[PDB]
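2024-03-11 09:14:02 INFO receiving multi-entity request
2024-03-11 09:14:02 INFO entity count = three
2024-03-11 09:14:03 INFO echoing inputs for audit
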Amino acid sequence: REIITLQLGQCGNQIGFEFWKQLCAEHGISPEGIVEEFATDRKDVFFYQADDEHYIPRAVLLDLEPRVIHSILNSPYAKLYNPENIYLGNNWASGFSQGEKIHEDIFDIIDREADGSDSLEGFVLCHSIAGGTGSGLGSYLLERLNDRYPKKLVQTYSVFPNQDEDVVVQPYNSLLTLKRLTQNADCVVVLDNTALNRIATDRLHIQNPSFSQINQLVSTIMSASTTTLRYPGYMNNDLIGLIASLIPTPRLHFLMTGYTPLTTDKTTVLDVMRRLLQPKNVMVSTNHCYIAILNIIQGEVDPTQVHKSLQRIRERKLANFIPWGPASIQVALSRKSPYLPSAHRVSGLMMANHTSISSLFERTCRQYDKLRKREAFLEQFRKEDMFKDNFDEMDTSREIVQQLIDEYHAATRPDYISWG
Amino acid sequence: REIITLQLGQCGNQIGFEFWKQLCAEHGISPEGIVEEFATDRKDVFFYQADDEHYIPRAVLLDLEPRVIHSILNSPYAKLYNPENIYLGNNWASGFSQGEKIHEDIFDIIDREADGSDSLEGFVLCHSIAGGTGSGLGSYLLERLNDRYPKKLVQTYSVFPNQDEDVVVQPYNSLLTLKRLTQNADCVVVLDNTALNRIATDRLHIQNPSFSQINQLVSTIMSASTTTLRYPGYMNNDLIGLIASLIPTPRLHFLMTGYTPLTTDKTTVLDVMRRLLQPKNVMVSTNHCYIAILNIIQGEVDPTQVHKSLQRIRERKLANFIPWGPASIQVALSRKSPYLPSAHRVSGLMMANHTSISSLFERTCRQYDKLRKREAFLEQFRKEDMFKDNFDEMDTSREIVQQLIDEYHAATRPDYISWG
Amino acid sequence: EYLQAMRNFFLDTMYDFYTSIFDQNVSFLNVQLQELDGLTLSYKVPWPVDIVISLECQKIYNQVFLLLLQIKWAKYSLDVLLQIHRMFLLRVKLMHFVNSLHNYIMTRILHSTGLEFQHQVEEAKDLDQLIKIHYRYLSTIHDRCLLREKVSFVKEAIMKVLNLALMFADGWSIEKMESDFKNCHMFLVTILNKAFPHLESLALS
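2024-03-11 09:21:47 INFO inference complete, emitting structure
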């Protein structure tokens, strides 16, 4: 149903601001909120129907030692939102300890925004793992959402720190936050710095300003994933029914996210499905195969081509899956948005669970272990000491992700009556 | 029925003069009183039918050490009224002692204006709490109206001194005058300096000339509250029947006053009711809920929308009230004035009793107590000593307002067979 | 203009007209107008207007004028103040309902149909259809205001809940009013649920 973006981390606040200006350009609205004269469709998934048809976006801004709010303040997006929703470190443990003492008023902010909405179903998070301020505070917020709301959803659109081995404290923080995301979040959409950066270097001619184009890529991905919710289709437009088909394996909830236009500047659905199953078009980094696949096609589509494309895709064995059930590739259709300022309105998306992400997780399972053996990169921060005296929480996270690896490899088998 | 404005205080005389020039612009009248050629409707609520169709406004001007009468004298509003109605300190106690010695001729002025009118039903007061000259003299006038006229109404349109903690003598004066307003006045419309000042800083770009725009805001509020009395509708056009629905709890007679255009420079009644129940549109500053709500809609209104708006407003649970009876939200309709010089004739008003005002009252219940403990801000004025030797009248006012707080909190309960 | 004046005389000046009645000679009140049940009065209608205005017209409006006088009578009697606490509850248990009834009588009946009927008669270009829309306004206000039947189980409840305000006004014991009130309220809401097809708007109140 209706979901409220909780932005946290520096890149998380960047993709939150980019997402709101993307939705301001997408919908027929002013930068005050007033309805335009070119804008019935639904505008109630992220926007409250406020005073003068002011579609005020429902958002939560969280950070520590504020940086980006100045860029919000001198912009016309301090006149679109903020009726009072903006709240003002460098390690997971420092962020955890800082979020421990101010858990009351941030939980009051969560309660205020839950009372502000009209139908609460899930809390979507626009977050960056090891963004600085996001690490630790984000995991503690995930623990608070799991403890206080077991009946609602926790969605995490997130990028994960991979530099292909830069920063020597981020594998500890990412593994601990990944354990918190397994136990305290309901669905994770995984993205990577190397995958988005490599595709950005491919489709463009940049290498240094990676952040500003990663904001555009993540905003387009998030708008494509919520296109069928914001603009009315008639399939599974609640978040619960949409993610219900998307997760085949109840512990393996990390989803591949491809996008057939890497740059948005003719084609059939067969060709973009053949494109979309290739990992080079996917922004996500032995026997690896999917468990269940679903794809969403929006544009100037002929539905009988969706028929023949599904027929040929599953029969030519490019949907690669050996499940313990019948779980399969799924087609889905969406209506492309009226009054996009973007041209070339044919666009495709895939949301599938693949075991190949386990190999990328194994790199993190290497890195922490490697940095535990050299012992000059745990850095002996005192906040890590007061977090846990035995430092066995990192071993617990390693155990949880090792169970995750064994569950991926058991889901490759036709039996899931045994995992390691 | 017919009510006569008793202006007192500096801001009280300012809103009185602003109210009379507002009614001069509102009605088709000259600044002498003569009927125009664009002006049957009723002009008998504030105006006597004098000599040459001179609609002379019935008013009482009271102050001490005159300041604003010079601005009245060099204006064409010394030719609209004053056939002889204008009468010429800084503390509540000095004003009380000054009003004690000249109670005879001011009561003669009240008798003269009561004999001047044709149907006396209530004495409406345009007053400012701690305006300087208004403090003390206003409370003594309230005592005189309660003693001499128990059979008539006392209406107080008033602003209350809140600076968010400026002047260190105003909490004593406001608490004593508030006790006098509870025991000696029949209905109080409460306004605040911070609420009107904050909304003035929001809708405009001012901060220093707060008084001149507070005059405009209070004049528009008072004209909106008396629109159905001045211009004939057919619901409860006597003051007694109008305030009869407005007060649900016989000691809690402090009414919220919202106004859907903050600036008067399309919309349905559902949207302005959703706007109007929000406290950000209200010019008035835990479990808080209303007891009974009433709203008045005047403009280009379709009455079946008043139906469907009332249906959806009470069923979606945005009318928040837990009463000890069935007391509810009420709709009311009014005709917008013919020949307003104002454009955008759709305007809404609410008159509701809310317990949240108790919290604002609690701030005053803090302040006097705080200033009683430091003991450098009672200031030991000798007029306060001759008012009461034991200084127990302030404790009596604190007891009365504490009973008021407990009565608000008992009215939140479904039982009013017990208050504290 | 006569229609506006007719709904101004049956249903400003009327509150003065009733404050004379609050504490008699009924022709005196006619001159006072000219500047719980019972009672009749008449005023003359001129002939070229009385051939397009019915005679049954006056009866139907006199009924609802007496009803509105009873409504203002209970609203004025129930405000009498300007175990000791117990009296306060018997205000609001009563003070809302005769007022919430006032929300159904005024807006849902006397303001929708009353405003549209004046607009309907201005657009007529024939003498017959102006009489016919007048008669079909009389019949639909004969159905909206219940003057027909089931008025020995519905209208008597409406009368007696105004009578309770009179009994509270005299009493200014208390516990024997609410037992009658909740009983007639339960009967009213069990009858007015769907059993004309707009009476459910007060059963929720």
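2024-03-11 09:21:48 INFO post-check: The first strand of chain B starts at residue 2 and ends at 8.
2024-03-11 09:21:48 INFO post-check: Chain B touches chain A through seven residues (CB under 8 Å).
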